[PDB]
C-alpha cells in the first residue's frame, strides 16, 4: 500500500536525524560546567501582595517599563496593576468570563486576552476622551485561545486548542498567517528577542520552531514525555526551556538541534505550569502544581530556591525586563511580587 | 515636588473608584450560581437547554425563587477535553446528561467512562455531579416489548434485581424499573468508591416533556452549598 | 520521543485465540495505566480495557469479560492483551493507548480521535 510506503519513509527519516543528533554530542552541558562556582542559595521575599481578584488568576504579563503589569481572572475582570505602589489603574470588565490569557503590548497602549470563547480581544488604553474600550475582536480560531504575544501594535501572535497557531493584522483583524503542524493544542508561545522566531509547545509532547516571515517550521524538540505547558526563551534566543505534565524541565538548544539538560527531582511528582528566566539566564524559575515555584540553576540544574507563599495552584509566572522582581500569580486569587 | 505629590493624589483618587465598583461585583459574583452542561448530543443535552429556558461557549441564564443561575454549554471544542475542563473547577455542580436508552456503538459505556474521569480528576475532587439518566421513554420501548438486550453489552444485568428502596413509577412495568435502576448503579458505584465526603453525586431519571428538571436543580444546588458551610465547624 | 508498537495481530476463525503486545519506548513505563482500545471497520474508537500503574487494578468492557485478559510487564515495558473464544464482532483495529499524565487516577482522552500517545494499532479479523 502507498500509505505503508510512507510510514516506512518517514521512520528511516527520523533515524537520519536521531543519528546526526547523536554525532554531534560529543559531551554534555554537565561536563562544560561542574567546574564554575554554584549560584548558591537564593532566598526572595514577598515585597507586593495585589488583591481584588475575586475568582483564580489564569495569566498575567509584565509591562515593558517593569512597573505596570495586567492579569486575568475568571470573574471577567482584567486588572492593571502599579506594582510599586499597589494602587490600581484599570479594571476591564470582560464579555466572556473564561479568559484563559492576557498580554501586554510593548508600547503600552494595548492589552490583549482570549480564552473558551476562541477571540482574541484587543483594549485601547489611550482612548481619548473616554475609558478603556474593545478596539478589536480577532475571530477565526476553532479552539480556545490559550497564549497571545503582541509583536508591535499592529501584529500578535496567538496560540489556540485548534493545534494551529496564528498571526493577525490587527487593523483589518484578519489571519496573515497559519502554522500548522501540532497535533495536540498548543498551550503556549515564546517570542523571540528579534521578532523573527517563535517557539510553541503542545499536547503532543514536542516543540517547534516557526519562522514569522514564512510560516513554516523549521525543527522540532522532543524530549518530553507528556503535556508541554509553558515555554520561554533563553535571553540571548538560542535556547529555549520547557515545562510538562511530567514533572520535569527541560533546555533545548537550537543550534545543536536537542536537549541539553532536564530539571526534575524525586520527590517532584507535579506537573510544571510555567517557566521563566532571570536577566542573565543563570536562573530558570518555574510554577508548579503543588502549590510552590522552585528556582533552579540553569547551568548546573540544582534548585537553589523555593517560591513558598500561595495556598492554591500557581498558574503563572513573569520576570521584569531589568530584572528587579519576580510576579506569581495563582488559584488563590491572589499575586505576590518577589525579589 | 509639588507635581509628584499631585501624580500619586491622583493615582489614589483612581484607586477608589475602582474599589467601589469592585464591591458592586463582588455581590453579584456571590449571589449568582454558575454550571457546566456536559453531554453528548444524542443524549439529549440540548433539550434540557429548552427545559431551562463557531462560538466557543453558549450560557443560558434562569432564576428559580429569586436565585440567578448561569450555565455554561460547550460550544466549539474538540472532544479532548483534559485542558478546557479544568476551567469549571469552582462551579456550583456539573449537570451530566446521559441517554440511557443508548446501550446497544456503546454509548453507555463511552459515558460510564467520562463520568470515571471527571469524578477522579485532582482539580474536580471538591465539584458535585447532578446526573440526569435521560430518555427513559426510550428505553422503555426497547425493554419491554423491543428486541434491544442490554445483557450482552453488561453481563452483570442478569444477577440485578431492583433494590427494596427503589420507588417504581406509577404504571410502570417492573422490566423496565431493573433497566433504569441498574444504570443508576452503574453511575453509583463510581461516585461511592472514592466519594470521600468532599463531593456527591446527585442522580434524577428525566424526560423531555418533564420540564420539572429545573426545579430539581435549584433543590440539589441548595443541598450542595448546605454541605459546603458545614465543613467550617470541623475547625481543627 | 514517545512510541507505541503493537504486533499479534492476524486471521483468525471463529472460537481461535490471539496473543497481542505493545511495545513501549519513549517513557517511564512503569509511572503510567495502559489501555486497549479498537476501532470496528464501521463504528468509531471503543475502549476495551486497562490496567493500572502496578496491574492489581484491571477493567474490561462488558461485552469481552471472561474472554479477554490484559496484562502488564514493567521490566520489558511491554502491554499484553490475550483473546480466547473470539467471535465475528471482535474483527477491529486494536490499538494500545497511554493515559495522558502519570501519577494520576483519571484517563482523559485516549478514545479521541487524533490523540497524541497511542499506537497505529494491528487488524484483527475473525471469519469463518
Known amino acids: 500500500s502507498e500509505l505503508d510506503q510512507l510510514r516506512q519513509e518517514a521512520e528511516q527519516l527520523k533515524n537520519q536525524i536521531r543519528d546526526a543528533r547523536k554525532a554531534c554530542a560529543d559531551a554534555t552541558l554537565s561536563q562544560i560546567t561542574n567546574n564554575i562556582d554554584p549560584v548558591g542559595r537564593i532566598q526572595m521575599r514577598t515585597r507586593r501582595t495585589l488583591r481584588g481578584h475575586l475568582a483564580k488568576i489564569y495569566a498575567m504579563h509584565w509591562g515593558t517599563d517593569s512597573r505596570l503589569l495586567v492579569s486575568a481572572s475568571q470573574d471577567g475582570k482584567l486588572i492593571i496593576w502599579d506594582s510599586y505602589t499597589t494602587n490600581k489603574v484599570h479594571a476591564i470588565p470582560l464579555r466572556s468570563s473564561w479568559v484563559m490569557t492576557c498580554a501586554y503590548a510593548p508600547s503600552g497602549n494595548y492589552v490583549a486576552c482570549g480564552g473558551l470563547d476562541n477571540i482574541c480581544s484587543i483594549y485601547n488604553l489611550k482612548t481619548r476622551e473616554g475609558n478603556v474600550r474593545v478596539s478589536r475582536e480577532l475571530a477565526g480560531h476553532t479552539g480556545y485561545l490559550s497564549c497571545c504575544r503582541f509583536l508591535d501594535d499592529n501584529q500578535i501572535v496567538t496560540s489556540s486548542g485548534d493545534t494551529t497557531c496564528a498571526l493577525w493584522d490587527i487593523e483589518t483583524g484578519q489571519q496573515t498567517t497559519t502554522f500548522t503542524g501540532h497535533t495536540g493544542d498548543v498551550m503556549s508561545l515564546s517570542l523571540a528577542p528579534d521578532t523573527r522566531l517563535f517557539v510553541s509547545g503542545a499536547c503532543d509532547a514536542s516543540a517547534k520552531l516557526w519562522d514569522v516571515r514564512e510560516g513554516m517550521c523549521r525543527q522540532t524538540f522532543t524530549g518530553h514525555e507528556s503535556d508541554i505547558n509553558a515555554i520561554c526563551f533563553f535571553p540571548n534566543g538560542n535556547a529555549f526551556a520547557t515545562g510538562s505534565d511530567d514533572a520535569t524541565c527541560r533546555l533545548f538548544d537550537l543550534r545543536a538541534d536537542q536537549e541539553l539538560m532536564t530539571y526534575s527531582h524525586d520527590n517532584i511528582i507535579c506537573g510544571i505550569t510555567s517557566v521563566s528566566f532571570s536577566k542573565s539566564g543563570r536562573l530558570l524559575l518555574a510554577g508548579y502544581d503543588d502549590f510552590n515555584c522552585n528556582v533552579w540553576d540553569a547551568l548546573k540544574a540544582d534548585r537553589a530556591g523555593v517560591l513558598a507563599g500561595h495556598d492554591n495552584r500557581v498558574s503563572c509566572l513573569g520576570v521584569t525586563d531589568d530584572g528587579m522582581a519576580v510576579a506569581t500569580g495563582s488559584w488563590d486569587s491572589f499575586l505576590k511580587i518577589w525579589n | 515636588t509639588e507635581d509628584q505629590r499631585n501624580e500619586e493624589k491622583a493615582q489614589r483618587e483612581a484607586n477608589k473608584k475602582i474599589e467601589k465598583q469592585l464591591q458592586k461585583d463582588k455581590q453579584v459574583y456571590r449571589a449568582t450560581h454558575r454550571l457546566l452542561l456536559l453531554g453528548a448530543g444524542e443524549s439529549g443535552k440540548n433539550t434540557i437547554v429548552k427545559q431551562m429556558r463557531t462560538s466557543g461557549i453558549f450560557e443560558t441564564k434562569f432564576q428559580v425563587d429569586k436565585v440567578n443561575f448561569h450555565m455554561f454549554d460547550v460550544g466549539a471544542q474538540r472532544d479532548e477535553r483534559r485542558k478546557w475542563i479544568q476551567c469549571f473547577n469552582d462551579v456550583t455542580a456539573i449537570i451530566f446528561v446521559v441517554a440511557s436508552s443508548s446501550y446497544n456503538t456503546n454509548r453507555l459505556q463511552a459515558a460510564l467512562k467520562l463520568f470515571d474521569s471527571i469524578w477522579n480528576n485532582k482539580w474536580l475532587r471538591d465539584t458535585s455531579v447532578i446526573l440526569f439518566l435521560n430518555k427513559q421513554d426510550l428505553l422503555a420501548e426497547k425493554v419491554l416489548a423491543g428486541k434491544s438486550k442490554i445483557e450482552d453489552y453488561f453481563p452483570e444485568f442478569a444477577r440485578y434485581t431492583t433494590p427494596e428502596d427503589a420507588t417504581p413509577e406509577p404504571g410502570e412495568d417492573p422490566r423496565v424499573t431493573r433497566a433504569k435502576y441498574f444504570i443508576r448503579d452503574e453511575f453509583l458505584r463510581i461516585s461511592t468508591a472514592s466519594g470521600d465526603g468532599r463531593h456527591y453525586c446527585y442522580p434524577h431519571f428525566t424526560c423531555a416533556v418533564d420540564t420539572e428538571n429545573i426545579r430539581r436543580v435549584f433543590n440539589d444546588c441548595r443541598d450542595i452549598i448546605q454541605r459546603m458551610h458545614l465543613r467550617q465547624y470541623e475547625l481543627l | 520521543q514517545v512510541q507505541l508498537q503493537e504486533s499479534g495481530g492476524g486471521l483468525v476463525q471463529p472460537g481461535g485465540s490471539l496473543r497481542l503486545s505493545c511495545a513501549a519506548s519513549?517513557?517511564?513505563?512503569?509511572?503510567?495505566?495502559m489501555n486497549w482500545v479498537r476501532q470496528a471497520p464501521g463504528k468509531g474508537l471503543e475502549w476495551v480495557s486497562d490496567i493500572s500503574q502496578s496491574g492489581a487494578s484491571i477493567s474490561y468492557t462488558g461485552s469481552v469479560k471472561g474472554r479477554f485478559t490484559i496484562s502488564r510487564d514493567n521490566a520489558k515495558n511491554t502491554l499484553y492483551l490475550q483473546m480466547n473464544s473470539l467471535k465475528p464482532e471482535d474483527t477491529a483495529v486494536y490499538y494500545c493507548?497511554?493515559?495522558?499524565?502519570?501519577?494520576?487516577?483519571?484517563?482523559?482522552?485516549?478514545?479521541?480521535?487524533?490523540?497524541?500517545?497511542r499506537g497505529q494499532g494491528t487488524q484483527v479479523t475473525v471469519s469463518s
Open positions: 519513549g517513557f517511564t513505563f512503569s509511572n503510567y495505566k
Open positions: 493507548a497511554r493515559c495522558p499524565a502519570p501519577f494520576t487516577r483519571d484517563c482523559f482522552d485516549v478514545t479521541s480521535t487524533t490523540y497524541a500517545y
